[PDB]
Structures are given as C-alpha cells and as structure tokens.
Amino acid sequence: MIPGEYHVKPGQIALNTGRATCRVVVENHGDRPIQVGSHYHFAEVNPALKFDRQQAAGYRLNIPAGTAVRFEPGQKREVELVAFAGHRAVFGFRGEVMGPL
Amino acid sequence: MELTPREKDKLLLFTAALVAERRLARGLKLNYPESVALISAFIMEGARDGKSVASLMEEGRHVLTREQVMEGVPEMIPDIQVEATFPDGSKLVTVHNPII
Amino acid sequence: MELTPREKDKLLLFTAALVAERRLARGLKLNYPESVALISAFIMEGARDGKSVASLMEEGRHVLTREQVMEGVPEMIPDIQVEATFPDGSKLVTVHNPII
Amino acid sequence: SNISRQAYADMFGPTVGDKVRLADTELWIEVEDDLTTYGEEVKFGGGKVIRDGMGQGQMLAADCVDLVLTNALIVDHWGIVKADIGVKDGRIFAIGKAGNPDIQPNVTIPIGAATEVIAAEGKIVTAGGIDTHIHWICPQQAEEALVSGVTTMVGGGTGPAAGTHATTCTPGPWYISRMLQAADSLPVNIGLLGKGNVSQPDALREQVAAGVIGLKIHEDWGATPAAIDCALTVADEMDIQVALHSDTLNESGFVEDTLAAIGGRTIHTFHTEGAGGGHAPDIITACAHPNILPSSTNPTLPYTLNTIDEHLDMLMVCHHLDPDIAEDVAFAESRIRRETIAAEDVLHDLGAFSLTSSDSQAMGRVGEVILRTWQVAHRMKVQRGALAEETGDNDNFRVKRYIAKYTINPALTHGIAHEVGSIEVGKLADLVVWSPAFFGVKPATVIKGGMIAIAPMGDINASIPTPQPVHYRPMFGALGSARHHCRLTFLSQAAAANGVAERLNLRSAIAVVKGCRTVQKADMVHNSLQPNITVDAQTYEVRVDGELITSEPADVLPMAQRYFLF
Amino acid sequence: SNISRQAYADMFGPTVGDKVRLADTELWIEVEDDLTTYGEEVKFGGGKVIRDGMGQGQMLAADCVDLVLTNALIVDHWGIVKADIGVKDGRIFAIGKAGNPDIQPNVTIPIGAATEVIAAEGKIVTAGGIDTHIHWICPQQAEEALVSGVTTMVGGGTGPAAGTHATTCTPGPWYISRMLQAADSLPVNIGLLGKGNVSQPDALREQVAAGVIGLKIHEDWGATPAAIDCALTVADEMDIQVALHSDTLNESGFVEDTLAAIGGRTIHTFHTEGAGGGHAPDIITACAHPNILPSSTNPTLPYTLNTIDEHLDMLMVCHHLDPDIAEDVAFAESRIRRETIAAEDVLHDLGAFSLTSSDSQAMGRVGEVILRTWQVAHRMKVQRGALAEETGDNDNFRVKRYIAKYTINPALTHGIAHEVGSIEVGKLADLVVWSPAFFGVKPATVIKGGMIAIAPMGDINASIPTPQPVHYRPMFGALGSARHHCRLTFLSQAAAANGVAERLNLRSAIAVVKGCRTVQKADMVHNSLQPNITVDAQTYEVRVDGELITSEPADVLPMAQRYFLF
Amino acid sequence: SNISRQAYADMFGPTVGDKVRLADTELWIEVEDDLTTYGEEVKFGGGKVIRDGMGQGQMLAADCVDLVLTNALIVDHWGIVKADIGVKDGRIFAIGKAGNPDIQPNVTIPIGAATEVIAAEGKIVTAGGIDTHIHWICPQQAEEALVSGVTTMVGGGTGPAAGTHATTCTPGPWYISRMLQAADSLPVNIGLLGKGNVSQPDALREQVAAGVIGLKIHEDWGATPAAIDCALTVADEMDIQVALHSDTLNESGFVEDTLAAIGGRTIHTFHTEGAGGGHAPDIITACAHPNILPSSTNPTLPYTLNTIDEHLDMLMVCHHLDPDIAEDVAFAESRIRRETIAAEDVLHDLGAFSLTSSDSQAMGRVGEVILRTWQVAHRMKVQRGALAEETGDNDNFRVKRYIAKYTINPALTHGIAHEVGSIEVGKLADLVVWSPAFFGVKPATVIKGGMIAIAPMGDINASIPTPQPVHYRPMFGALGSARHHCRLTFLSQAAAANGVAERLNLRSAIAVVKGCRTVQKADMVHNSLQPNITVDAQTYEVRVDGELITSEPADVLPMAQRYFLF
Ligand code: NI
Ligand code: NI
Ligand code: NI
Ligand code: NI
Ligand code: NI
Ligand code: NI
Helix, strand or coil: CCCCECCCCCCCCECCCCCCEEEEEEEEEECCEEEEEECCCCHHHHCEEEECCCCCEEEEECCCCEEEEEECCCCCEEEEEECCCCEEEEEECCCCEEEEE | CCCCCHHHHHHHHHHHHHHHHHHHCCCCCCCCHHHHHHHHHHHHHHHCCCHHHHHHHHHHCCCCCCCHECEEEEEECCEEEEEEEEEEEEEEEEEEEECC | CCCCHHHHHHHHHHHHHHHHHHHHHHHCCCCCHHHHHHHHHHHHHHHHHCCHHHHHHHHHHCCCCCEEEECCCHCCCCCCEEEEEECCCEEEEEEEECCC | CCHHHHHHHHCCEEECCCCEEECCCEEEECCCCCCCCCCCCCCCCCCCCCCCCCCEECCHHHHHHEEEEEEEEEEEEEEEEEEEEEEEECEEEECCCCCCCCCCCCCEECCCCCEEECCCCEEEECCCCCEEEEECCCCCCCHHHHCEEEEEEEEECCCCCCHHHHCCCHHHHHHHHHHHHHCCCCCCCCEEEECCCCCCHCCCCCCCCCCCCCCEEEHHHHCCCCHHHHHHHHHHHHHHEEEECCCCCCCCCCHHHHHHHCCCCCCCCCCCCCCCCCCCHHHHHHHHHCCCCEEECCCCCEECCCHHHHHHHHHHCCCCCCCCHHHHHHHHHHHHHHHHHHHHHHHHHHHCCCEEECCCCCCCCCCCHHHHHHHHHHHHHHHHHCCCCCCCCCHHHHHHHHCCCCCHHCCCCHCCCCCCCCCCCCCCCCEECCCCHHCCCCCCEECCCCCCEEEEEECCCCCCCCCCCCCEECHHCCHHHHHHHHHHEEEEHHHCCCCCCHCCCCCCEEEEECCCCCCCCCHHHCCCCCCCECCCCCCCEEEEEEECCCCCCECCCCCCCCCCCC | CCCCCCHHHHCCCCCCCCCCCCCCCCEEEEHHHHHHCCCCCCCCCHHHHHHCCCECCCHHHHHHHCCEEEEEEECCCCEEEEEEEEEECEEEEEECCEECCCCCCCCCCCCCCCCEEEECCCEEEEEEEEEEECCCCCCCHHHHHHCCCEEEEEEEECCHHHHHCCCCCCCHHHHHHHHHHHHHCCCEEEEEEEECCCCCHHHHHHHHHHCCCCEEHHHCCCCCCHHHHHHHHHHHCCCCEEEEEEECCCCCCCCCCCCHHHCCEEEEEEECCCCCCCCCCCCCHHHCCCCCCEEECCCCCCCCHHHHHHHHHHHHHHHCCCCCHHHHHHHHHCCCCCHHEEEEHHHHCCCCCCCCCEEEEEEECCCCCCHHHHHHHHHHHHHHHCCCCCCCCHHHHHHHHHHHCCCCHHHHHHCCCCCCCCCCCCCECCCCCCCCHCCCCCCCEECCCCCEEEECCCCCCCCCCCCCCCCECCCCCHHHHHHHHHCCEEEEEHHHHCCCCHHHHHEEEEECCCCCCCCCCHCCCCCCCCCCCCCCCCCCCCEECCCEEECCCCCCCCCCCCCCCC | CEEEEEEHHHHHCCCCCEEEEEECCCEEECCCECCCCCCCEEECCCCCCCCCCEEECCCCCCCCEEEEEEEEEECCCCCEEEEEEECCCCEEEEEECCCCCCCCCCCCECCCCCCCECCCCCCEEEEEEEEEEECCCCHHHHHHHHCCCEEEEECCCCCCHHHHHHHCCHHHHHHHHHHHHHCCCCCEEEEEEECCCCCCCHHHHHHHHHHHCCEEEEEHHHHHHHHHHHHHHHHHCCCCCEECCCCCCCCCCCCCHHHHHCCCCEEECCCCCCCCCCCCCHHHHHHHCEEEEEEEECCCCCCCCCHHHHHHHHHHHCCCCCCCHHHHHHHHHHHCCCCHHHHHHHHCCCCCCCEEEEECCCCCCCCHHHHHHHHHHHHHHHHCCCCCCCCCCHHHHHHHHHHHHHHHHHHHHHCCCCCCCCCHHHHHCCEEECCCCCCCCCCCCCEEEEEEEEECCCCCCCCCCCCCCCCCEEEEHCCCHHHHHHCCCEECHHHHHHCCCHHHHCCCCCCCCCCCCCCCCCHCCCCCCCCCEEECCCCCCEEEEEECCCCCCCCCCCCCCCCCCC
C-alpha cells in the first residue's frame, strides 16, 4: 500500500496528431550552448544555430510540451518540427513575424 | 537572546523532533510528521557541530530505515530539506530518498 | 510535516509536561498546571501506543497520587480531558478524579 | 512523436483510464475524461510552455483569466475529469483547455500577461467544503476549518457562553449585528443562525431582518410543536432555512408529533442519527420523508471500537449526569445507541443521509468533517463492496456520492448553491488543491475567492519555500482588505433590502440566500433515497423494508496515525 | 417541596449565610443577600428552565435583555449578593431576578428569543479592573492585563523608547494622535496621559486639545514647583487629572515645598510609598492631605522576604548605579526602605492608600495588580485580624475595601466613573467571571462591553471546549469591528468638542472624562482615611498618632506557586 | 572641568578619532566628526539633562521635534558622524545638536514638552534597508525582513503560486489591486512589480495604470528580444523601472543580443553574477555598461566552502533536473560556476556591482540581505586589505561603499530616493538602531515613519522590559491605523493620477515613483565602476583588463554561529 499511488494504464500516447511535420538539420556555430523549448517559434531561435530558416517558418519542435532540445557548441542534429495551429499568428520572439503566418 | 522569527520557528521543529525521539525509543514505527521532524533536527545539530553540507546530505540518509517507519512513509518523503547556521552561515541541506 | 493548528497546539501541551516531568524527578510536589500537563501528555502517548479509550480512562487515575502534589490540587482537578489520534481516529479521553 | 503513459503521468498527471488511490484508503478513482489536446498541455517554468508568444498570448486583461490551475484532476459531484481551470474576477470562468489561441488549438481558457499560474499536475482539485453545523464558540475554529479544506461555515453563537456551548444560536439583533461585524475578520464565508425557539412570530422576523439566514430550533431552548410551527411559518414567509435538534425527552410528544408539527414543510434535521440530540430512540426515521434534509454530525462517523466509550463519557460531562444515578444511566443508554450509530454509516452509503457537518466543539470536531466523510466511504467499501450504481473497476460513483455530502448538498439546503458548493462556471472560486497521498487530510493550497488564503509554508528565511518546519500559515487572501474582497457574508433577503450591510459598515462582499423553501430530499445530489425505515422501541434495531441495517466497528482507520503528530 | 442547603449550593451556587474561601487565601466572604425566589431560579440546559413559554418569554428584543448571567455571586464595593445580571446594548441593565413574567413571579430581568445566557452558578462576578499607571512600552501589555481581569488601562507612552521606559507620558500632538489611532486595535478601554512637565501653559493645553485625559508630572522630565503649578492650573481649566512622580533628589525642595506648590488642588500621587519614586524619604506623608488621591504600584505589595533584594538590584539596573560607588549606594538606601515598604501594607488595610496600579514594565507587573491586592488583604488578615468595621464571622468589609482599590477608586480619580468601575445600572458591561478556586488569579471569562473578549479555551478541534491544552485565547469581542463597538477611547472635553475622533477617523466608541477636579480623599470608597502621619528623617520609621506602623515580611504567599507554571 | 576619553565614551558614546569594531568582523569604523558642544550633550533620566527649563524648552509643538535620538553614531553613505537626530511629522528634521536654545549654545534640534526621547549613546544608527528582489510568496516575509533591518520591500507575487515561486511578478490588474489592498496590513513600505513579458504594449500600460512601479522580465515567462524591447518602450513612456532575469538557455540569442535589444535604455539586472538566472555563462559582463544598474542576490554572498554544494542541489529541486540525466548535469554546470561566484565578491568590493537584494524564498534569504553584505565586506578586507580610496587607519570608505548597496542605490534604481534610502533631511524617518556588538545581525530598535514598529522585548509581565525571554515583537508602529500613517505604498504616476488609491480605498500614505529612466551606473553612490570585463566561454574565468578576478572560499564567517540559536 502506497498512499496516493497511481495505477497507470500501460501504453503510449501519440502527440500532436494530424498536424504537418518536417525535419531540419541544425548546427550550433556559436561557442556557448543553446537550449530550445517545445513551443518556441523555431525560425526565430538564436542566430548562431544554422539551418534552413524558411522551412522552419510557422513551426515548433515536435517534442512533449515543456521539454527542450539542447545544442552544445559545434553539435549538429536533425530535429523534427510541427506546425503551429490556432490562428497561426506569431508575436514575440525576435520580432521577425509580429502577425499572421 | 533577541530571538528572531526564524529562530523561534526552528524551536517548533526541535520540539516536534523530541516527540519523535521519545516514540522511537519506546520501539514505535514512526509516522510521516515524526520521521520528517526527526531527520530535520539531526541535520540542524550536524550544522551546529560544524559538519559540511556534502557530509549531511549523505549522513541524513542513515537516520531511519524502512523497518522503523509505518508502511508508505518512505514514499511520502521523496526528500527532506532544512536550513541551519553552519560556521560559514545559513546553508540548505537537501537529503534525497532519506528512508530506504 | 504540514502541521495543522491542532498539532501545533498539542506541542505546547507536550512541552508543559516536560517541565512537570523534570520537576517530579527532582522530588517536588506538583502544582495545578504541572499536574494537568503531566497526566494529559501520558494519555496522548497511550493513544499513540494504540491503547483503548476505556483502558486510558482507568490508567490515567494512577499517574499521580495526593502525596506527589501540593495541598488542594486534587480538588482543583475534578477531571482531565484530552483528545488524541488513536488507530481509529481522534477520540476524547475523560479521566474522572485522577488524583487520589 | 510518442511518449509512454508512465512518463506522461509523471509530467502532466494522470489521463483517461489511469487510477489514483485516495490517501491511504481503499478508494480508487479513475480519470473519466481529459479535456486537453495531447502535445498542447500548458506547463510553467524555465524553458516551458507558458511564455510570451507561446502558451501565453497578447490579449488585454479583459480577454484573459486572472488565474489558471494547469493539468488539474477535478473530483466533483458531476465528474472526475482532467482539465485546466480558469478563474476571473474571483469566480470560476471555465473548465477546459488553457493556452494561447494564436498558436494552439481548442483553447477555451486564454492566458495573457495578466494571468497567474498554479501548477496542478499530479494534484486533485475539489470545491471548498461547507459546514452547516458550526457553534461559534471561538474564532480560532475558522482557521482550523479552513486548513481542513472547509471554506464556508454556517452556524450560530456569541463566543464561549452557555447558550452557544449547547446550541447554534446567535440570539437577537444586538448579537447578530456584532457577529456580522466580527465575521469580516474571518477568512471563510459565513452565514448566521438565529434563535428559532419562540411562539411569537415577530421575535423571529426581527432576527431575520437583522441578518440571520436561518433559525435553529434546539431542545435546550424548548423544541415544542408550537415553537417549531412558528419558526416554519416565518421561514416560509422570509425564504430562510430551519435547522432542527428535536425533543430527546419526548416531553411534548414523540417523533410522530414533531413530524406532524412540521406538516410537510422544508426542514434540515441536524445529527439525524440522534447521539447529537433528538427524539429517543427514533429520530433516525425522519430520513424517510421528502421535506426533510438529513445531516450527520461527525463523532459517530464512522462506527469504531472507541465510539461508544468516548460517547457514554461525553454525555456525562456535557449534561453532568454522574454514573451513580440509575435514571441518568437510563438517559445515557437513551441518546447513545450502538444500533443507530452502526446503521448511520450504511444510510450514508445508500444516500438516505445527504450531508455531513461538524457540530463544532459541541459533540463535533471542526477540522474533521472531510476526513471522517472519507473514512465512512472507506469502511463502507471494505464491508459492502461496490455500490449498485457503480460502473467500471473503480469507486467513482461512491466518491461522487460522498463528496456531495460536504459540498453541494449543504449549499442547496441553505440556499447558497448559486454562489458556492461545486466547481461550476459563475460560482466563487473557493478551491482546494490536494496531493493524492494527503487527499482529505492535509491540503497543499486553499484558495478563497481567487486568492490563496492559507497553505503549508516552510522556513520564512529559507532560499526556497519547502525547507522545514512546514506548517499552515495565513496567506495574502486572509489579510485585511484583500480578505474582505475574497469572502462572503450571507444575509437574508430582508436584511439586504433593509441596508443592514451599510448600517453595520460591513466591509466584505455580500450574498443573499434564496430557494430554502423549495429544496426537498429529491434535490439532494446522489443522496435522494427515501427508505421505508423503522426503529424497534425496545431493542433500537434499525430496519429498512424489514431488513436489519448494521455494520461492524473499525479497530484501525486510514487518514489517522500515518499523518498526525498527536 | 424542600431541598437541603448542600444540594442547593451544588446546583445554584451559595445562598444567604453560606461562606466561600477566596482562592487559597484565608479570606472568606459570606453571602449577604439573595435576590431570587426559591424554586424560580433560572438554569439553562437540556430539559431546564430557560425554554420557550417557561423561563423564556414572548417579548420582542426591545423588551428583553441581550445577555443574562444566571445565579451570579456578585462581589462589589456595595455588597456581596447572589443575583441574576441583565445586560442590554452593552451596558448593565439590572441586578435582580431573571425569567419570564408570564409564569414567574418578581421578574425584573426579562428573558426572550433575543437573550444569550452565561451560566454563573457557583461563580463570582466582579467589575473589570482599572489600572491607571500604564507605561505603553509594548501593545502585548493589553492582552496580559485583560487576561488578569483588567479592562481599562490609563497611561502614557509611544513604545519601547527611553522616555516611555521611565515615564507614563505620550509627548505631543503627533504621538498622542498616533497612540489614539493604535488604541482602536487593543481590546481594553484606554485613556492617555500627556507630558505635564513644562512651565508654559500653552504647551499643555495643546496636548489636552489633542486628546489626553491627564498629564503626568515626572521627575525624569523635571518635577519642579513651577512645572507642578503650571500643570495644575491647566488641569483646573480643562477638567483633566494630574498624576505625580515627585522630586526624589529633593533638588528643588523637600516634600513640604512640593505640597505647597500643589496648593490644595486635586492630584493623584503615583507610588505614594516612594520606592517607585518621590521625595526621599517622606513622600508617604502625602496620604494625610484631603486633595491627594494616593496610589501604590505593585512590586512592594505585599512586603515579602525577597522584596528588598529584588528592589536594591532593580534600581542598580534602571538608573545604572553600580555597587562600587558609595554615593550611589547612599542613593540606593534612599529610594529603597524596609520601613516605608512594611508600613504601606498597613496603610492599605486602614484605607489611607486608596488605589493599586501596576507601573507596567517600569517597576511594576502588568498582570499582577489584582493578584497582589488580594495577597496584601490576606497578609493583613493574618497579621492584624478583623477590621474595626467588620460585622459577622467573615471578611466582607475587608473584601469591599480592597476591591474598591482597583475598580471604583481609580475610576473616580480619573473622571471615568460615569462609564466604568463597578457593577451598577447604566455602566459599560465590563465583567469578569471567576471560579472561587481561581479568584483573583485566572478568570473563567472576561466580558468587554457585553461581548466575551478573552477566555481560557481548550483544543480547537475537540468535541467540546474543555480538553487540553486550555490557555487564554482572544474571542469575538476582541476582533475587528466587534472590538470597536465594545471598547472605549476616553478623550478630554476639549478634544471631543474639537472633533478629534472624526479627524483621526477613530473607530471605537468615545467617552469623555469629567469630574477630575472635584474628587477628594473623602470620595474614595471605603478608603478615605487622612491619618496624622510622620516619617523620621534619620531612621525612616513611619508613625500614625505617634504609634509605629510596621508589618512582617511573608516567606510564602497564596495565589502563587499553586497556580503558575513558571 | 575635564573628563577622560574612556569615561566620556562610556557615558555618551564614542567621539572624533575613536574606533568601533562592527559586530565580530574585522571592520573598524572611526568617528569622523562630532556635532556636539562638549559639556552640552543631552542625556535623559533621573536627574539628567532633558528636564523642564534645562535641556527641555518652553516651545509649542510646532517649534520642536516629535522625537530626538540622542548621541547617535550615524553610519551612512555621506559620513560616519556623532550627532543628535531630530524627527518631526514622521520625517527626518535635522542632524545636529539637540536641546534648549534658552540655556544651551548651538541648538539646531529644539526639545520641548511635545518631544519623545530615544537614548542612542553607544549605538549605531543607519537608514532602513531596501530590498528590491522580493517574491511575495507569503506575508510572513515582511516581519522577517523588518526584524533584519529592512523597511522597504519591492517585488512581485500573489502568494505561494507557481508563477510567484519563480518570478517577482504580480500579474494583471485584479492581482495588482488585491496585493495593493493586502499591503496596508504589512509594516514595511511596498512597491509592486507587474509581469513585463509581453509583445503588446497595452497589456503592460494596463498593469502600470493599475499600480505597479516596475515590470519584471523573467525567462520563465519568455525573456526574448521582442518582450524586452516592448517593456522598455512602456517604461520610457511611464517613468517606471524594468528588472531583468535574462535568457539562461541562450534560446533567443546570447548576452550581446539581449544587450542590443536593451539598446542603451536604463535597466536593473537582477542576480548579475548569474546563479539566480541569466545568459550562461556571461551575464556578469553587463556590469561594464553605463545604462545597467547591477544587483546581486544573496546566497552567493560571500563565496564559502558550502556555496556550490547547496547551489548544485538547489537547482536540482527548483527545476527538477535529477543527477541521472547527463544533459541536466551539463545544465547544472551551466548556471552554477565557482569562477563567477568567486569574482562577484571582488566586483562588489571594486564597486562594479551596486546593489544587494534577497530573491526571497526563490534562491534568496529574506532576513539576510544586510548580514551577507557585511560578510562580503569582511571577507574582502581580509583577502584584499584596504581600498585605494581609503584614508586613515580604518575601514570607513569600504563601510560607506557597502552600506550604499542596500540603502541609497536600490532607492535610486527604483525611483524612490526622494522618500527613503538614507538619513537626509526631508526623508521618511525609517531608522534602525544597533548595538555595536550586534551590528548588521540583531537590531535594538526598528523605527518606521517616526514610530517604533518592532523591537526585541522581554517578559511582558516583568517589572522591566529586559528580563528573559527577549524576542522580537511588533510595536505600536505596526498596529492598525498607526501602521497606515507610518508606511508608504508606492504607486506609478499613472495610477496616482487615475485615483487608484481612492478606488481601492487604500488606507496608507501614498508616494509616487519618479526618475527611473534617467538613473545610470554613474549615479550609483560609491559603486559607479564600469570595468572592461570578459568571461571565457570554455573555462568561465572572469578577467578585468586581462587580469584574472578571483577570491578564496571562507570556511568560517563572522555574524553567524555566535548569534543564532539554529
Ligand atoms: Ni444539536
Ligand atoms: Ni450543535
Ligand atoms: Ni514613577
Ligand atoms: Ni511609572
Ligand atoms: Ni531571477
Ligand atoms: Ni527572483
């Protein structure tokens, strides 16, 4: 007997189903580490990350909400991205969009 | 003594540990508040002795075992945290999984 | 420990009984607040041990005798009442004429 | 992208089909539904979701909530569901999916710059409890009840005076006015009960016009058919509730005479089992009637090995009976009965008793209404198994039936369900956050009207709020003018119309009671049973349809020695 | 129908001719009169008298009392009587026989639906004490005094500042205004004293117009003939009282010069014995004069084996004298004298000293005014036997003489006897309920303006209010707006006329002082003696009509180790 | 007439050329000047100077001070001087020579009947501290900070909610209004910070108009260049301060990108060293810029043997990292660095870091801002010797540089230096009295707006205020309406203009912030250094002009085990 214990149903949960996805190769060209959150607008990440910024427009990382991907200096990796939904209006970040798309 | 509110608050923790210490001596299996108070007061006295934070983080895991507490108590306590005045001022001691 | 106000209030009662216990050990004749605290704390520990309400109602009458208290104290205490967490939850223990 | 169900539950709390044990009891709840979109859960923290342009939007304060409780597991009379809860202007705004409509789908709770966050993942959220049997013996009862998860207290009294030690009555306009003024200082919602024992209606109308939301008829002030008739006539005119503690002595009549004096009018019967007071030995039969809303007081809940012992010696102190007099022992064997105490637990499980309450410091424990309600549910699961209404491999229906006893049903009984009593849109945001291991025992956060009012808090000088000693301390929702904005004083319709709040210079928000006369047993949520109940005058055995109703006493209970220092 | 006197006393408390011992002292009171009709006593409880149509009537709130204290044994300056006490609108309504005029005879206190009950059978009820020597060093002194049975506190100060540590002075309009604002938070009635030491009358009129009810002349601010003359001139114009702590140093003159500066005008001499301050060694001779109202401070009361030891080492800390300097030891043997300390107890017993007071945390104990007054009465009974005024086999007259010292006489001295100071019709209902075994030590209930303000209270979560730990806790009469309605702030006539209460936004009830200039020694109830007293300048021996006045020091006292934990 | 310098210092406190050790540290202050006339020092007590016609004059209240602190040793940014301090209408009136102009020469502080006295001979008097990094997690933090000597608290929060546990943000008009109402109950001056993380200016203007005096940009709400730009634009329009906790993750850019987004506008960088948060690993380089006002939070102050251990295991609890994951340990070695922690102490000693603050219960200790500031000064004296600015054989300049860090510099940074922050004529009288042996650890008296608000106080029932137990207890300056008159709630100019105080019915005195946008590094008193600082991205070594900046960790500190019970 464990007070407040869970009895979790075995299995897996599929995340962000029915949404457009794409893969991009990213390389950290900076000399300091960069970590990117699940919901950050990927096209507006730190300029030291080198990748196809046009392909990432309107996309975020396809990872569990609240998690992150770390890029140590020099690190190259392929990441999977998922399209933003709702109104698809981007405001904030580096101030590159500030409106619909 | 010019006791500040934090010093008076720690008097409450010391008193709760005296209750726990007397129950442990009678051979009772300790409950949740008794176990937390007992391990917490041990850490405060270790700080008063001048033990280091790294030594108490380890020593605090050997105050109570699973056989000296009620069923479910180790799982109700994932960690214990307490601050005390060390020779080099207030420091936080975090003891991970103290009851095994 | 997440102490509730009732738990903190019982810490006050436990502390007053420590004062009384140390005076009794020196051979003093106990006064009114000391006698009440001493018998009350005995009952709380009996509840923690898992003794029944009916057993403590009787055992609480043999903690102190007329020869261990000041003149007039037995008559100032017609009964002692205290509640504690028994294995089956909070219960009230009433001890009639505890000092004889 | 996929995640295992175990890693998912550790990050966001359980989802559909997962089960949780309530504290150290044998009760298990199963998540019935989840209002999220998997992958779009909002989480607050360093590098997490609730950030500018991400899970937090660009809207002005008018277009977003003041507070969001993220990933909450709601336990309420209507369902056991996983959802985000939005609070705006101190009231429940929505139960649904929070976030930013600019980038996220299906957002019904918008998060902006004006939004505070409470992280509820892995926690259970319930409505604040409602105790309708308070004796105002001391103000310290308010903090004790609040710490236990009770946010509304209905009762009567003037302090530690003989009248209040015995009855929930605030007698007369002067004491009513003084207690309404005192209520502004307390961090719970309050409604007062006047002295209902009088045979002249004007002496009652005067108390209602002064501010009481109900009248208590108590045998210590004479619970005769004429006083009962008079109180109900005024109650019907003024839309207030009547609470009854009947004639234990059978001085003026038997239970059938009290029931005839009531004449089918709406009434709340306090401590219906009878130990707390009432016609000896058959007050319990009132739960058969459609106009009776029956409650239990808590020392008889559940039936345990020490119950009788502490109850035979409780009556000997309160009424000063002494075991030497045979007629006083015959009186002791009259209010205290093993048969009605054992039957009461079963009648709660069947839904024939609809409310639980304390009877604070007058044969009742103010901090134990919730705790004892859950101990009864546990003891009933163990002895009786699953309810007939139960679906699935869980105790969801039993949980919904029992939570209604201290939340929605007291609110409906006292005419305050339009303000409090459940987690529903438009109601005051009185919410309680529990860790599952401490469910029903020690809450993690008590929210009053949208502000945290009390919570466990560690060392004030520490580098974080978690270091020892952790004990309950009042928060900003319990201070001065913030407290006044976050609590309600309930008034009768006549007192509100007459400008009592302005005359007394009451500083808290005011609410008015309504619908006290039209509520009936059939309206009690999941607790509307009208059984054909009889009590044997000789043996005191309780029968329902000729079948004996009994239960066995517990020797050990959950929610007890594992949690409390004393 | 008959009942034995022993069974009667156990049910209703003592009656005419019965005697009660006060706590563990040798003082016995005898019930002088009983206002009941035997058989018609009102008793509250299950199946008792106070019930609808029985001991409780049908009258509206306007025709009955708000509160009744049933079967009280009253101890006051005018009598030791058994009676019911009625309270209405926060004031004493009647002392007499309570009940229902419909069925009971000789009812002068009607009980209705609007009536609360305090069961006083077997208890002693007195007026709340009045301490007129308060140093406002900290606000915590208010609760300590209230717990001891003191409901009114007159003094001066701004907090723990050097001026206040030494003197009862609230200096100037800004501090007076701030302390009047702070007083609304305290559960006692308050009046403030200004700094009276100035030779320009306008600097005094300014303080009176700001709100002080008196002026303290203290030697630490210079107690010279010019400052004394100036303060008394203003006092005569503004109807306020002057309190004096005279020139111990004999710097400006001897006691005869201070007395000549006074010029027959009304004045209150603080710590008249002199240890607390005043002309060394003969300030005690002021009790011979008709215009002097003399009080004692409490550390010298009664004379005990440890008095001198704690008093020789008290002066060495307060004034930082050090035993190494001979001129400082010569000063120590000047304020601290065995002869005047032993004589003071006798002068209290003869009625030559009329008031007792604390001198709170400035050579005085705030919670011990009442306790020490009774210890003196006990030590005097033991050493001197019965007073010349005593009739019967009891100490009734000695009790009336001593109770007047901390109730009516301080009230008369400070011009507040029209509001407080005794149990009389029309006065504020500040009442203290005592169990006889704890009389003068630990009260059962403290009522402020008709509401219970503080009382011993047991476990908040318990099934009754009596389980351990029982300790004093504030009640509803001490909370927010209820407290404001139940306490008084006393103002001078000039401050009330000038709208000081409206300007400062004072929330409590206001009362105005009057009759400070016309009160004289002959007006001191049972304490009007003007003896022909002399002090020998060499030996310090006190003589009255050439007869040596002395007493022996106690080694053990009642109201001490039997009751206190530390 | 002559007196030896030793006897003089024992009676009046030290004079010119005398030296005092600060608590148990190695810091010595030397009295630079003395404003008295030898022989004319004012002393209060039996037979002393402050008496009618002597050191006390005949003036009306308008012509004298309300309070005098006699023979104070002032320690402030402008000097270490011996003087009397006069207070009138709750503000500092004069620093000079007190007494009576009728008989004494060079009197600039007149003493009359309306004057209270605080005896400061042998004590050090400083301004009340100002903490600008408060997380309003619980109201109990106010008393803890006040007891430590902090009288003003600037921060944000709503209670123990996830948003507040992590950030100093009071989000939105509803929470801002509720927290401003709650602030009236607290005995410290308060100003609130809103949530600055939004890319729409109207959502920020709304919070400023509701009452915040600043906006906190926190990485947990997204510290992106667009949110930073938006917050600074609004700050420039509304004359409020911006506080920054930068993007530790380097998600949106590196430190140079944050600095470019700032664009030379005025900003307060919180925990500039970086452990508390910010661009990893080089946020520390911001102290080189003229528009940056850099503060430290206190757990990294000073660098000690246990610092890292408690800081590596602090981040693992706050962010739930777990030592098993390599990427979380790589993150742990990113915010926690020995090199920047050791360099921070030196940067404080050189004046490159200008403020100290707590980060209360969110990687900071509310009662230790002052204590830790002095521990750094001690550790720096011991390791580095005398500062280049130091004259004489004393640490006067180092003391002036460090005291400015928690008094004047936070006040200048937040636009409140016109009201508080130093002992200067016209400022609020928030003063702290210290005995030299307890300097910086345990004060003797805390004065708020001219009234004592908290002080150590002994046994309430004792004959004097010094008997045990002595512990901190609230005084009259902390009660009800007196508290409202003695504290300030700071508002933005827009909130004051819009009648927010009248709308919310705020009862305390109101002050308005101004001059937040024009303050720069050059304005930081004795802490205006702009060093050429670099951080190595690989090794994290801090260099100034190519020279390595480091210090050694302490094993034992002063102001620690000698003073505290736990
Ligand atoms: Ni009842
Ligand atoms: Ni009841
Ligand atoms: Ni005096
Ligand atoms: Ni005095
Ligand atoms: Ni930060
Ligand atoms: Ni912070």
